[PDB]
Design a binder for this molecule. Structure first.
Ligand SMILES: [K+]
Ligand SMILES: [K+]
Ligand code: NA
Ligand code: NA
Ligand SMILES: [Zn+2]
Ligand SMILES: [Zn+2]
Lengths: 341, 341
């Protein structure tokens, strides 16, 4: 399969991240893509290509315009206000609050933010557009008839909802790709989020869309970021009822239990009638991944890929989470390999 | 007027405050109570006494039990979790999120938090409790017949809502005082929040209660903390319909304008028929406040006090905001002076 990757991801290099009550160097760092790209290259998938330029039409079909407009200038406004640090939200529209949008930059960032553990820094916007571009190109390859393709996206995007950034995500790539596929002739598309964390952004974007089915395998939100979405009972709403399938799982879940979930989701997706599947690939489910509590081993990522591919429909793998350890590349490369069959 | 002050306020001495993307020394620090207490004693208000011991019965009538339970052990669980910095929420139940409560510390701290600019530190709970004692005691004084009293509360509490902390607040001292007055025999009590910021926590606690009226004057939320509550449109709900009155004002607002809103707020308080008024006093409205944009002069506080006292009903002044310059002590004493007549 072809690999779409943009060097512009490096433009996203924030120096701080709120964690454990401290500002530390962001976990979703640049070296992540370097290794992923290297591990997959040696896996035989060395047909890497840069993405082409794209407008904002596709993304404007899945994200709020005010939200996008906010991102493009957030940093400039932030620095203009005179802040010495990076842009980090402090106040949030939580329970029983007004729906109005603040005019001030300090209020807007909070309004368009679901988690303070992510900071907007110089380049973030341009970086996000490029990662989005990789997703669009990957989607185009599926639309052209390619059986599979991998968009090495960075920054990731499954936590970016309709009008909010966080969880290290700004533009929901997986969602723009799903939208792209539709725009190219698909009537029904499915998104499968295997990343450790619930793809709360993706869920929100398609909760009321009946043309897209969302399935996510993640850690019980009762005790894992994002904490406020991902419960089994969230099955959709209104025009999108029945189109969301969450599979929350407790600590120590092994592939035995995890794989059963994968099986069930694939069933619901098949019953949904998806013409293709956008795979939100996050390899943070690895037993040796710092911020995660599932017990998956590297071999399992080969099973994961093969299994999803066995669906018989075209697949577009989109990069999401997975950090720290040097096995990230290997694990990602194994999912691609399993997909290759 | 009697002055209630506890030394255990010093127990609250956080080391960090997320401001402008950096963790800086908290604005609401111990040096505040020291200055205020010294200024009021120097203005004659030297009959200072420590609060008596009080249970949780009163506070449990304005705050959620779950929330209170959370605060008491928040710091213990945070350190026991392994985090290095202070307890700061990173994830927030924002738009379209589940109403479910997380089980881990990371999830609960966000669930019960409306702003990340406030961290839970060791001793915070005990401090918050003493501060609450000072309000209760001050309340009993009003119930005993005193026409005025001053509860030098710290930490402050007007930003603490039913089940969430923030804005340097954890327990809504003013709210507890109001409840106290009603438990002592009152049937209709009003709370006047002159603090620069909106009393989002207070408004939230009595929003659906008809026995309490809430009037607040504050920097327009469209561009001032907390940003998500305080618009004129917010007048109450259900059983509390019509019992909330917000008076938001723009940048550089001088007393010549601020005072006009005070006269109207007082007028609505009279129409409400309040038997007494708990005045949430924040002096951050001062023209020199490091984080507010109002242009009130030290002398105005004397006018403010005299005007509020002219209400004719008993007044309980509960300390809230006011930062930076030492004039905070002067400004606070000028209100007690204007109230004392
Ligand atoms: K997931
Ligand atoms: K106020
Ligand atoms: Na949907
Ligand atoms: Na009320
Ligand atoms: Zn993840
Ligand atoms: Zn204040």
């Amino acid at each position: 399969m072809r690999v779409i990757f943009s060097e512009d991801h490096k433009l996203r290099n924030a120096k701080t991240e709120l964690y454990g009550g401290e500002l530390v160097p962001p976990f979703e760092a640049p070296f992540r893509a370097e290794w992923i790209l290297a591990a997959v290259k040696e896996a035989g998938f060395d047909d890497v290509v840069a993405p082409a330029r794209h407008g904002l039409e596709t993304v404007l079909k899945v994200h709020d315009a005010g939200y996008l407009n906010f991102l493009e200038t957030a940093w400039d406004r932030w620095k203009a206000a005179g802040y010495k640090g990076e842009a980090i939200a402090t106040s949030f529209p939580v329970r029983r609050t007004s729906p109005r949008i603040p005019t001030d930059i300090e209020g807007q960032i909070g309004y368009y933010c679901n988690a303070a553990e992510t900071a907007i820094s110089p380049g973030t916007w341009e970086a996000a557009l490029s990662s989005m571009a990789s997703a669009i190109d990957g989607a185009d390859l599926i639309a052209a008839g390619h059986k599979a393709a991998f968009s090495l996206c960075r920054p990731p995007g499954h936590a970016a909802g309709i009008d909010m950034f966080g969880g290290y995500c700004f533009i929901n790539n997986a969602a723009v790709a799903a939208q792209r596929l539709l725009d190219k002739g698909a009537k029904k598309i499915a998104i499968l989020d295997v990343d450790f964390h619930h793809g709360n952004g993706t869920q929100d974007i398609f909760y009321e869309r009946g043309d897209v089915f969302f399935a996510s395998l993640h850690g019980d939100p009762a005790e894992a970021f994002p904490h406020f979405l991902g419960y089994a009972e969230e099955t959709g709403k209104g025009a999108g009822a029945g189109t969301t399938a969450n599979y929350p799982m407790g600590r120590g879940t092994p592939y035995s239990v995890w794989g059963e979930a994968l099986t069930d989701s694939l069933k619901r997706i098949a019953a949904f009638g998806a013409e293709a599947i956008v795979v939100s690939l996050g390899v943070d489910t690895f037993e040796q991944d710092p911020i995660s509590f599932f017990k998956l081993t590297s071999p399992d990522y080969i099973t994961m890929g093969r299994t999803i591919a066995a669906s018989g429909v075209p697949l577009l793998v989109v990069m999401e989470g997975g950090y720290g350890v040097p096995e990230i590349g290997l694990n990602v490369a194994n999912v691609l390999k399993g997909v290759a069959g």
